[PDB]
Amino acid sequence: YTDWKSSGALIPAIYMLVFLLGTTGNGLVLWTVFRSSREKRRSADIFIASLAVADLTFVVTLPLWATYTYRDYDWPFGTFFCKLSSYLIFVNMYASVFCLTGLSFDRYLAIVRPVANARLRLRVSGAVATAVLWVLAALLAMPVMVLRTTGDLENTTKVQCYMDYSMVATVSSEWAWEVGLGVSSTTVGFVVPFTIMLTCYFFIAQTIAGHFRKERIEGLRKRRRLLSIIVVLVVTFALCWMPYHLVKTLYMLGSLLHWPCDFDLFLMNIFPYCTCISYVNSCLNPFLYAFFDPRFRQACTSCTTASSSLAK
Amino acid sequence: YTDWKSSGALIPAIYMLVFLLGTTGNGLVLWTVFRSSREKRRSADIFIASLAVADLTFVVTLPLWATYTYRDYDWPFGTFFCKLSSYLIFVNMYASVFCLTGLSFDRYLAIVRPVANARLRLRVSGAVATAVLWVLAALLAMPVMVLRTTGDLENTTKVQCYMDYSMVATVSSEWAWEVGLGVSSTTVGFVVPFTIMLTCYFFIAQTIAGHFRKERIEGLRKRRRLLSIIVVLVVTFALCWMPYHLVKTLYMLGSLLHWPCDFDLFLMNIFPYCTCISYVNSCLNPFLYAFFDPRFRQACTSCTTASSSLAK
Amino acid sequence: TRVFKKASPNGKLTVYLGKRDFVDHIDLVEPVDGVVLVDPEYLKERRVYVTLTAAFRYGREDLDVLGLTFRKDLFVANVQSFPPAPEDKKPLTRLQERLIKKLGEHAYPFTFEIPPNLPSSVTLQPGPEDTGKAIGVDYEVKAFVAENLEEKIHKRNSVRLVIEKVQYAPERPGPQPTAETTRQFLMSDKPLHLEASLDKEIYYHGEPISVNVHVTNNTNKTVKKIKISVRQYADIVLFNTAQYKVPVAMEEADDTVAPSSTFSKVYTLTPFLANNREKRGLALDGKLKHEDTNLASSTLLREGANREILGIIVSYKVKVKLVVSRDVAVELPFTLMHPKPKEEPPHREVPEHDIQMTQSPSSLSASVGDRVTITCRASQSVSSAVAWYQQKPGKAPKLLIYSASSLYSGVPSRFSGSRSGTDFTLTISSLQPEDFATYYCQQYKYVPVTFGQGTKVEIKVQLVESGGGLVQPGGSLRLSCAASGFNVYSSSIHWVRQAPGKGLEWVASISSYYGYTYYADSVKGRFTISADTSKNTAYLQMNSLRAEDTAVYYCARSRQFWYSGLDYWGQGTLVTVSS
Amino acid sequence: TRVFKKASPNGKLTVYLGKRDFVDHIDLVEPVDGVVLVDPEYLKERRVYVTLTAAFRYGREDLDVLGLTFRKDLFVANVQSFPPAPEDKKPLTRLQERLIKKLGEHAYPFTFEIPPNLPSSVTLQPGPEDTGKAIGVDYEVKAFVAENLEEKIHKRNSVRLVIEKVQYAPERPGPQPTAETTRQFLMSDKPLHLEASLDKEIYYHGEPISVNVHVTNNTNKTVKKIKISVRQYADIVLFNTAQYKVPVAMEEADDTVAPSSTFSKVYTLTPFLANNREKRGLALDGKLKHEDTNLASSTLLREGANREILGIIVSYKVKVKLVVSRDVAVELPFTLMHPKPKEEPPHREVPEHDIQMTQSPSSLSASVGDRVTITCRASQSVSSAVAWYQQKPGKAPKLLIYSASSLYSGVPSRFSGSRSGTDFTLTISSLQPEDFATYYCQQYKYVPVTFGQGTKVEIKVQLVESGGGLVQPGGSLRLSCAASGFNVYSSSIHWVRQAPGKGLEWVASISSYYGYTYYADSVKGRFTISADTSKNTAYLQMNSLRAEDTAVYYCARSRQFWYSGLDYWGQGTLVTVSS
Numbered sequence A, B: 001y002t003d004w005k006s007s008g009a010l011i012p013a014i015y016m017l018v019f020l021l022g023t024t025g026n027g028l029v030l031w032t033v034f035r036s037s038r039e040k041r042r043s044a045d046i047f048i049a050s051l052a053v054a055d056l057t058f059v060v061t062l063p064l065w066a067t068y069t070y071r072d073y074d075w076p077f078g079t080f081f082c083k084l085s086s087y088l089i090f091v092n093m094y095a096s097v098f099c100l101t102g103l104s105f106d107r108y109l110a111i112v113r114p115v116a117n118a119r120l121r122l123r124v125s126g127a128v129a130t131a132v133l134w135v136l137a138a139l140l141a142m143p144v145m146v147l148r149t150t151g152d153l154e155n156t157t158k159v160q161c162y163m164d165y166s167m168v169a170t171v172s173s174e175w176a177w178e179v180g181l182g183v184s185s186t187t188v189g190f191v192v193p194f195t196i197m198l199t200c201y202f203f204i205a206q207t208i209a210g211h212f213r214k215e216r217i218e219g220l221r222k223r224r225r226l227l228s229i230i231v232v233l234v235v236t237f238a239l240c241w242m243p244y245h246l247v248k249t250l251y252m253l254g255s256l257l258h259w260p261c262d263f264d265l266f267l268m269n270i271f272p273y274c275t276c277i278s279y280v281n282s283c284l285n286p287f288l289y290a291f292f293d294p295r296f297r298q299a300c301t302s303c304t305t306a307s308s309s310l311a312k
Numbered sequence C, D: 001t002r003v004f005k006k007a008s009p010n011g012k013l014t015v016y017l018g019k020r021d022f023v024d025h026i027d028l029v030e031p032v033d034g035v036v037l038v039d040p041e042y043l044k045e046r047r048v049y050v051t052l053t054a055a056f057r058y059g060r061e062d063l064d065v066l067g068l069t070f071r072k073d074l075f076v077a078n079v080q081s082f083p084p085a086p087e088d089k090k091p092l093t094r095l096q097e098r099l100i101k102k103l104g105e106h107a108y109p110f111t112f113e114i115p116p117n118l119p120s121s122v123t124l125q126p127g128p129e130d131t132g133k134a135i136g137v138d139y140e141v142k143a144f145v146a147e148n149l150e151e152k153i154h155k156r157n158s159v160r161l162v163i164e165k166v167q168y169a170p171e172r173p174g175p176q177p178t179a180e181t182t183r184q185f186l187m188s189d190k191p192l193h194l195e196a197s198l199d200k201e202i203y204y205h206g207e208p209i210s211v212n213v214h215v216t217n218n219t220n221k222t223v224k225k226i227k228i229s230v231r232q233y234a235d236i237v238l239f240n241t242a243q244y245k246v247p248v249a250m251e252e253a254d255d256t257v258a259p260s261s262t263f264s265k266v267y268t269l270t271p272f273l274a275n276n277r278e279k280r281g282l283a284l285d286g287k288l289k290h291e292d293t294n295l296a297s298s299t300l301l302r303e304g305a306n307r308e309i310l311g312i313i314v315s316y317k318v319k320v321k322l323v324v325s326r327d328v329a330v331e332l333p334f335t336l337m338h339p340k341p342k343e344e345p346p347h348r349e350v351p352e353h354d355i356q357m358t359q360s361p362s363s364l365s366a367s368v369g370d371r372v373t374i375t376c377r378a379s380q381s382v383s384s385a386v387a388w389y390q391q392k393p394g395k396a397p398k399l400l401i402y403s404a405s406s407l408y409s410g411v412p413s414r415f416s417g418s419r420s421g422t423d424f425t426l427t428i429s430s431l432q433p434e435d436f437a438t439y440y441c442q443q444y445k446y447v448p449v450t451f452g453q454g455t456k457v458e459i460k461v462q463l464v465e466s467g468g469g470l471v472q473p474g475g476s477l478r479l480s481c482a483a484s485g486f487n488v489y490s491s492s493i494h495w496v497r498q499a500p501g502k503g504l505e506w507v508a509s510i511s512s513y514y515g516y517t518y519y520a521d522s523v524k525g526r527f528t529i530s531a532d533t534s535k536n537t538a539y540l541q542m543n544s545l546r547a548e549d550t551a552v553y554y555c556a557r558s559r560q561f562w563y564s565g566l567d568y569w570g571q572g573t574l575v576t577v578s579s
Ligand SMILES: COc1cccc(OC)c1-n1c(NS(=O)(=O)[C@@H](C)[C@@H](O)c2ncc(C)cn2)nnc1-c1cccc(C)n1
Pocket: A065, A085, A086, A089, A093, A162, A163, A244, A247, A248, A251, A267, A268, A271, A272, A275, A278, A279
């Protein structure tokens, strides 16, 4: 396909910029989590810690792909590192969305339904949630580790790291496997987690509005601010993760929908911009989830009853 | 030249075993340090932490070289990873020996000359020593990074990672730069640090022998155990870092010594064995330094003056 | 008698309140009566409003996202104390005019009325590590001074008093509950019929619940274990009406009900806090601030008038289950709460985690008919928590009075107590022959319980103790006092000693319900105390005995709930520890 | 007159020592005399060995590594108590015989002799955060019971009482130091000649040192700064005979000494602990256990017969340095330590971080020939730390007796004090005509300083307290106490008040040497006090005035070291806080 001349030079620079911003911000947030270490606040601090780890490891393997795009798509490193970098990228994609969804669910449980939040053992349930979250992310990204290799064709001899679905009866299933794995990923990493997060946040918005129904003139301003943070969180998630999954599903649909190949060219050369848009949320998250929660900011920065006489 | 058939199969086995043992032990010791870290307000725990990091990173890059030896000496990874793995290996070698020497000097200052130990700011001096230790290790290993590269299809396409001393210095300095870099590396990473460690421990031994002269039975046995542990430390350093540097300097002297050229090939085949012997230090380092100190073991699991009347 | 007082940071605003705990009935509650001082010179144009902040906190701590305080308002009634607008004209309570007689006109009154249907003060258990604030409903009388109500509250010009609302057991009895559910297994020749029941419907905290379970196991399939569970239906109607639960009393017998058999058994389950000290979300009765209190008391909603009472509605029910080898369960409702206590309960850990008395001279000489006031200079303020004991020499002590107040039941009127400052006194009019006996003044406010120095006049259903036979001047002795007619969880079995030919001394104490033990420094860790629900027994294991340990030892029994002095003492045991 | 007592946990092994400290004069020291109670039954056949544990701890913490405790014995001598050694035959000191006169013969005695040359008790300043045990030389009389020396010691059967050794300044004066170091420059014709000297050789802690730097500058090279440094030569002669140093005081005067100049101006430098609290390694006079103790006292050797004294000798120097703009420095040795105190110093923070007094007479008639037993009760123990004072009509308070027994110089002999329990008394046998005044009793043990209630019988050098005038009914007012004739670091200054026609009441206090301040509860944080050395003046800022602040304020001085009540009283000003 006719890859854009502009893309080859644009993608590496923004990739480096995202690497720097995301890695330094996630370093700062994990530094906060380590330095505080009071075992005092943020009963669900482990969710933000897991999200920070996922985000940092999501941007850490980025420079290899920055070179890949700067190397005119010629992977220099080994087959093992193509496998590991892709597996880390996908595990971290899934764990980032999962941690965002689980944190939204924790906030929902601890706001709209605070009775159960106070009742139940929060810390152990959160720890088990993180454990199963990471195990499920690893098991969901396992296929992109077992089905990824290097070296395709062409007298250029340019080593290309790609998902070679041809390992499993390629002639019997090539588009079948492409569409199946793509749909499974985009429907068990985005559609389900995203709808869970959106419903949690919708109920949260309703109940915060109800709680600040009257309060006071200051109170309704705080309601405005809280609704603002909710909208900005959900909409930054939306803006970041819609281009990627949208073009990905459009491409998977073009297989059985005789997409206009000419416009399929456009889809192909717009996808990398969608992946950096996905990375935008990874870069920006530490400046919202930690910044707007001033626990991180602080970490970085009457008388008495009496008796007398009942003289008859 | 003939690489031993036994070596090809054997070397990766010891390499992987060292990887497992050293990585697990260093992870455990760092875990212990982090369990408490700041709260105990320790003084020289920074040196143990730096040494644990040094050993861990020493073994972390090792499996790449394990596959290098299993791949009939084919480095499949990139030039960047040859550079980075070699640089990490050498930085960690130097930082391990340096942290052992600094720990020895700290113990000497805190035993033989305890008055100054109480006097000075142990925290500030220790932190500055750690910072300069790491910076100096990085600067000592910079030349290997700037002179490590990959290539040499050698009519077999067997891509190899090696020092290309011809990279900077002209052909006029062909053996000259090999000699300079090897001699400098030894004389500023082992000879000087080892001399400091040995003299510090000799003074420590003399002073403990004098100090424990009193008492009886139990005290003499405790002194004997202390001398035994000092001997174990220095001799487990010698048995491990003697073969490496010794064969290195012997092959070095072969430039102007024209060896029988069969003992020379013997040296060539044993050098990797000396490398794993050197790694024995990092492997066993936790089970000695953390084991002996009771703090790690703990982490793992009256009247009062009165006045009266002087009746005259 | 006395009256409850609270101050303010200024100290000018002093709030006088009567009985802190209020009784709510199925129709109407007791009106709140109180008074507050006022300073017109400081009160240039402000106004002292007092209000009944009856609010439900349903969020741990607060401001989880910096501005979210999860504390709904279930009721607030505001009234200005001064000048009282001539709109209510509600005649003052005798208590209020009494406070005027004590303070004066500057002590302006206020009377509050609560709606018939509102939650009873209950607080959910924070848990082993929750700290913060307890999720639950709570009442607080708050008085603050301001020219207008909308003005911001003031740190100095404000007073908060945590009032509590409680429901006591109705005077009448109730019908014994029944529960019958018939379940058919694969075999249905005679479908299994559950015939469980309960002795009585109204119980007090501690009285053993005798779950009577009877069934005919006609069907072939057998049951391994019978699970009996006095469970707390906490109906937390806060936004999302729910019925969160947690079992308080748990019992897993081994009664394997074999088939073609009729099983019948009565099991004694006493719901007490200690055995469930960690089950987060347990509803306990009203806390003033942080003290330990009994489990939540059953609330009596208006029959057939379920207004969907917001907050926590606590009911208790015995779940009886038969576990088939390869689970037939039913429920029984019961109402659990205190009786109507004549003494308004003191909402502290009555013997809260030193003091000494000085009783009048032992040579008080008086003949028949000669009235005498036997005085006692106390060390500190026991707050009318003193009992006088007619210690008749050679025989067990006898309780004369509780709390320096009306006499213990059956004690004739000849006795009478006078409490004044940090010293008390008991008077007697006519000295009947029985009055030729030794007297003692006793304080029960601070561990150790501290008695008087004794006074002997000069005229001129059981407690069994096992152990004796003076022995072991440094060994160890096990003295077991058992009370045939006192529920172990319904009382604290005290352990006191009188030194050989000397005064009485408190040594040890057990609080079964709360499951906590109290010891004396005079024996400190040397003496161990314990009691078992086996046969109403309390073992006392003295260790490393001494000649100084020579004494005469008595056990006793004190009402576990609202500990009111000592009302039963044991036969005693002269143990002059020797070889 | 009291005497020091210590005992074992058993309570029978009771060590009695005459006085905790001793003077190691050049020839010898005072022998350590003491006694110990004994029980041959409890001491079946084990004997009480008493030893002088003169040790030197030279490693921080307790056990840096297992089996490595960094202590060396510099002296130990042992005596067997019961029966006394038949060979000792050493006549008892008076104090031991008096102890027998009050205790039993079971109080076996013991006398110890120290060698002429041994280190003086000194401890190195641990630091802001060092914890462990401060390393230094320390003596501790230890008495432990065993059948043989090698037999195991018992934690309970052992008494460990820290004894301090000190060297007080020699009675006579000595030769003042000098310094003459000559350095040449470009114009080497007249090389710089240094003539810095010092006022005196003997100083007490606090007495400002007037460093007299006289230098003749004619070489063109000028020096920018002048550095005067009172530095602590800590001659640690243990193992490595080092000379670790720390600068106690560092005056930095910007005397840009230029060619053709002669600056002889004396500059004052007063060493004190406050502005050196963090300089790890600063030697300080021996602590009992942890009490804040002043700097190390200059130890005196025997004309240089340095037997490599295996201890922390300390000697103080005054270094004067001149730093060339494009560094000529010299030393001046001097000896710093306390005078000989008639009362044995109280080795504690005398006003250690409530105690109220009561006086009976108030107004009791007595003409000439009547001894007035002006008695007093104290809330708790004051330990002979009360000073008697009288107020002649309309005049300032005057100190009659100090130490509760001692006699302030000049004061006549008619006064006499008597301790008894927690109560004291004063008497005047022959009422000298000037006996018409009211008397108090100023306890000085625990802050706040609480005096007597005044007792006016019936007859039938300067202090400048400036800033009077009844103004400011709620503002902040500054009062200046200029106590010319008393170094601020040499005396703690006190602020008290007397209510109209009432007794005296303490308000505030500042101890400059330790650089720390004390305030009264009655004024808590409302009042501020701070002393500046420049004018040797204490400014008291009473903030947020009140009508309660209407009283007469008085200033007082107290010997900074071994605080002995109040020895000087100011004019006093009647302040009526008002418009
Ligand atoms: C450009 O993308 C990559 C570039 C380099 C490495 C990659 O992976 C590790 C990814 N990549 C991949 N590759 S791909 O699977 O071969 C993908 C190219 C293929 O399927 C496909 N062709 C066309 C369309 C329209 C859709 N899809 N899929 N996702 C990611 C990814 C990576 C990072 C972040 C995110 C959100 N996504």
